[PDB]
Amino acid sequence: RVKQQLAGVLDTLQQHFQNIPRSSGRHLSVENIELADIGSGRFNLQIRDGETLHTTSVEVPEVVSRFQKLSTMLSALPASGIMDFDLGMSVVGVVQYARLLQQGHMDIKQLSEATLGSMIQIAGNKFLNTEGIQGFRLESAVAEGMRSVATRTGGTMGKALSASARVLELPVLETVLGTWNLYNSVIQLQQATSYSETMAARVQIAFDSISLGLTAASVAFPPLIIATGPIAAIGMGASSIARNVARKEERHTQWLEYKKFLTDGSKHIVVASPERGL
């Protein structure tokens, strides 16, 4: 349903954009980001494209109705106790998609999908933050929602939401923001994939990354340390020449023994192995 909704809004924005030429990419700049009408999804699209142009009329009533139903469950927090996990996967997917596209950062198709994701983000800021706080965070909101769901209904779904929310709160893993993103870049640029397979690739990486995040699969094993051994260090090899000095004999022999002791103690002061490291 996200596939079909995004395709519909994509063709809507494309037929809205025809009035001005594409002029490569990044030129539209989608300066206006405001949802004028909640019910009809009257997203204001000021597609400047250099000159004065405001295609601020567009019909996006697809995702916003979902978001309204989301705020509905949220308001039903003290009035209902029906477990709702499917919107659970819905939110953990839309927010992770938004963060993935924001971090990833030109064809209009992909340039537009980024605008749809940003619209998702601002709409979430809208209903999730009933008041206005500049420090509003989406992960805090989904954490509060999962806490309410777990308190209302407990069990395997509760730990599933806790794991998913905690993983989403954690920053995107370096490999997740790494290998898959430039993998998609290679498969979309060096290989001439059209819009459909690239779009499917984006959604499949997003959803399976959420799926692997919400599940746990790892092994831990502390390293073993035993019998850490320096050299023998008998201890009688030093401060013992004086035992052979007090023999009631010539003082010069004792002196030369002492200087020999000082020499043999100052010929191996430091020995280092740069190749070994120690």
Binding site: P230, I231, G235, M236, S239
Partner: peptide, 19 residues
């Protein structure tokens, strides 16, 4: 550091107290 206290022999104990 060095292994100056390895066994329970009197010499090792003596060097231990001295060092």
């Amino acid at each position: 550091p060095l292994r100056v206290l390895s066994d329970l022999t009197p010499e090792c104990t003596e060097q231990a107290i001295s060092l």
